[PDB]
Ligand binder design. Structure first.
Ligand SMILES: COc1ccc(-c2nc3c(NCCCNC(=O)C4(CN)CC4)c(Br)cnc3[nH]2)cc1
Length: 286
């Protein structure tokens, strides 16, 4: 951290803070994650795995600096996040061709991770980073399985996590991404819950309370209660107007209760919704 020159704070999580920084040596402008340890060797070997997980839609981990018994992560810097971009686009909304490019690119990023059995676990607009070339990238990626388990947002949590499933799958990333998709389209968060039960109950209201019919094995989940209220499902035409039939078809399959019926990243990339996919460049004000 002697080689770096903190420019401004650009982010924060549970494991540390992130600074835009300039490499005193090399002129390089980077995003530097200062990991707050209180060292663990298992955590080190895990992070070093992430140096190999390289993809155009994953924020590039440049270096891992383990020194003075502190850990720093040096990433590629991107000039904006999707939250700020969505906020800046909220009067007219993000154009659908741009929505579709970003969904396809993130689905490409996830197909890759997931093919390597790596899950993200916390996809949200603030973890999606955009550049001036029309690229979108997954950030803060696999840095949860490392050390183990600010108000953390629950809005993009898959239902199996909220129901206490301890061994959840890559399908939790598709759910989160589905929620992000919906939010880009409608310009409102799909499931803005302010606690786990409020989050779960907001999902139940929209998609219906899950049962053995739509989700075999659900009544046997750790935090499942026979006493959960029994809401009927609403139509998707009400949930994401004015998303077209292809978009709403894909979204429904990304929001299946059953994690084994939920569409994979690979299958989603073949969905008719991306027949006409392009790569627009956004208009970014930095
Ligand atoms: C609001 O305008 C913004 C401008 C730039 C960023 C920005 N943030 C980052 C960032 N990290 C902060 C955002 C992603 N979140 C995290 O990395 C956390 C929190 N989940 C710290 C682990 C990384 Br890495 C690379 N380029 C970045 N660019 C964010 C917002």
């Amino acid at each position: 951290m002697e080689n770096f020159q903190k420019v401004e704070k650009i982010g924060e999580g549970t494991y540390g803070v992130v600074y835009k920084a300039r490499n005193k040596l090399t002129g390089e402008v980077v995003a530097l994650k200062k990991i707050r340890l209180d060292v663990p060797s298992t955590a080190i070997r895990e992070i070093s795995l992430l140096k190999e997980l390289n993809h155009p839609n994953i924020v590039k981990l440049l270096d891992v600096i383990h020194t003075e018994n502190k850990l720093y992560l040096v990433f590629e810097f991107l000039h904006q996040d999707l939250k700020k971009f969505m906020d800046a686009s909220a009067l007219t909304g993000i154009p659908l061709p741009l929505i579709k490019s970003y969904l396809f690119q993130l689905l490409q990023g996830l197909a890759f991770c997931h093919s390597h059995r790596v899950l993200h676990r916390d996809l949200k607009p603030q973890n999606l980073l955009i550049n001036t070339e029309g690229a979108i990238k997954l950030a803060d990626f696999g840095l949860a399985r490392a050390f183990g388990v600010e108000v953390v947002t629950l809005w993009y949590r898959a239902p199996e996590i909220l129901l206490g499933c301890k061994y959840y799958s890559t399908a939790v990333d598709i759910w989160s991404l589905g929620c992000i998709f919906a939010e880009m389209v409608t310009r409102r968060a799909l499931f803005p819950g302010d606690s786990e039960i409020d989050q779960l109950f907001r999902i139940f209201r929209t998609l219906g309370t899950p049962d053995e019919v739509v989700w075999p094995g659900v009544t046997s989940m750790p935090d499942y209660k026979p006493s959960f209220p029994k809401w009927a499902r609403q139509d998707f035409s009400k949930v994401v107007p004015p998303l077209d039939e292809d978009g709403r078809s894909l979204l429904s399959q990304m929001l299946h209760y059953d994690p084994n019926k939920r569409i994979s990243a690979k299958a989603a990339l073949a969905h008719p919704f991306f027949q006409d996919v392009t790569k627009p460049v956004p208009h970014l004000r930095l």
